[PDB]
Design a protein around this ligand. Structure first.
Ligand SMILES: O=c1[nH]c(SCCN2CCN(c3ccccn3)CC2)nc2ccccc12
Ligand code: NI
Ligand code: NI
Ligand code: NI
Ligand code: NI
Length: 345
């Protein structure tokens, strides 16, 4: 076409505005595209589906079973039709499974709505400007690239049995107004550069609107550590959320500066609705952590790029560290990585 963006940026645009990718994500969740295509998807419907799951949360809280639920599930599946070859919403933590789907549908709705929004510019540049984000290619021979590559290589070996990783492209990203929304928290201590993985169908929403919290109608019990923004300090953890496969091996993971401050440290799931005061975030303690001996500090921001070693933390259910903040202003996105996954099987 007639694009003036660098070639890696053009490919990223085509990747995140891929409507076929959006449909496959919905099919992956067994949503019936015939009864509800990508065009029919709406925020008010996702909002009402969230609230239905919140009714199941109250119902499970008050202690009921199997005839309140089937009605609540019949309501859920009527609003969002599925195509099975109808599981119980009150068992096997299905509230979490459905609430993650709604999270991804919210981003897929934003991507599709943005895509349907002059002769001068190639549609690639038109869609790029809709993100209201400045994306520049990081030179592979730069100091930034070497730090980021080392961060990747040091924190993915523990999953080599599942897959290997190769950094294709590194982008520096600057969301419009995010540096301004984050400025108050740069005074907070304990700021770290952390990973956030996601499917490619989520990043049109991530770039245009930043990382968000689940809406108020979302069930707090649908999130392992409450309705917040989740980060990891090892790509082995965040890369799992790209949902790449051998037939879809290219994933996206971002690096973001997170103001953690005083961390409420936990060793198992806790559907937090409010933090204790003095605490600014949650840190789920994992069995594996980057070697603190290799931690480097950057403009007062810690980069825990050490090789994965055992943390010595017994009595924990988490394999990797988790970091959750509950204010969207506590996050400043800085880098976006394009990664090729090489699977063993
Ligand atoms: O690195 C990690 N990545 C992800 S992604 C989890 C799924 N995403 C879906 C989209 N979503 C929202 C939010 C608000 C509004 C619309 N969508 C946020 C949730 N979880 C992680 C969890 C633990 C550690 C690292 C990670
Ligand atoms: Ni490797
Ligand atoms: Ni629970
Ligand atoms: Ni999954
Ligand atoms: Ni507990």
């Amino acid at each position: 076409h007639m694009s003036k963006l660098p070639k890696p940026v053009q490919d990223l645009i085509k990747m995140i505005f891929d409507v076929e990718s959006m449909k496959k994500a919905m099919v992956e969740y067994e949503i019936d595209l015939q009864k509800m295509p990508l065009g029919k998807l709406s925020k008010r419907q996702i909002q009402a589906a969230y609230s239905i799951l919140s009714e199941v949360q109250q119902a499970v809280s008050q202690g009921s079973s199997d005839s309140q639920i089937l009605d609540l599930s019949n309501r859920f599946y009527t609003l969002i039709p599925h195509d099975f070859g109808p599981p119980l919403l009150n068992n096997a933590d299905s509230v979490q499974a459905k609430v993650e789907m709604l999270d991804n549908l919210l981003d897929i709705e934003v991507a599709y709505s943005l895509l349907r929004g002059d002769s001068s510019k190639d549609p690639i540049d038109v869609n790029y400007e809709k993100l209201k984000t400045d994306i520049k290619v990081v030179d592979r021979d730069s100091e930034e690239a070497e730090i980021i590559r080392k961060y990747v290589k040091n924190t993915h070996a523990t999953t080599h049995n599942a897959y290997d990783l190769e950094v294709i492209d590194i982008f520096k990203i600057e969301r419009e107004g995010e540096c301004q929304r984050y400025k108050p928290f740069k005074q907070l201590h304990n700021r770290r550069l952390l990973w956030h993985g996601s499917r490619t169908t989520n990043f049109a929403g991530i770039l245009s609107q930043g990382l968000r919290i689940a809406p108020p109608e979302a069930p707090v019990t649908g999130y392992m550590f409450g309705k917040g923004i989740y980060f990891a300090d090892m790509v082995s953890k965040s890369a799992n959320y790209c949902h790449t496969s051998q037939g879809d091996p290219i994933g996206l993971i971002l690096l973001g500066e997170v103001a953690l401050g005083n961390m409420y440290e936990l060793k198992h799931a806790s559907h937090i609705s409010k933090l204790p005061k003095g605490k600014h975030s949650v840190k789920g303690l994992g069995k594996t952590t980057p070697d603190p001996s290799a931690n480097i500090s950057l403009d007062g921001v810690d980069v825990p790029l050490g090789t994965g070693i055992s943390s010595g933390v017994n009595d924990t259910s988490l394999l990797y560290n988790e970091y959750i903040v509950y204010d969207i202003a506590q996050v400043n996105l800085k880098y976006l990585l394009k990664l090729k996954f090489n699977f063993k099987t």
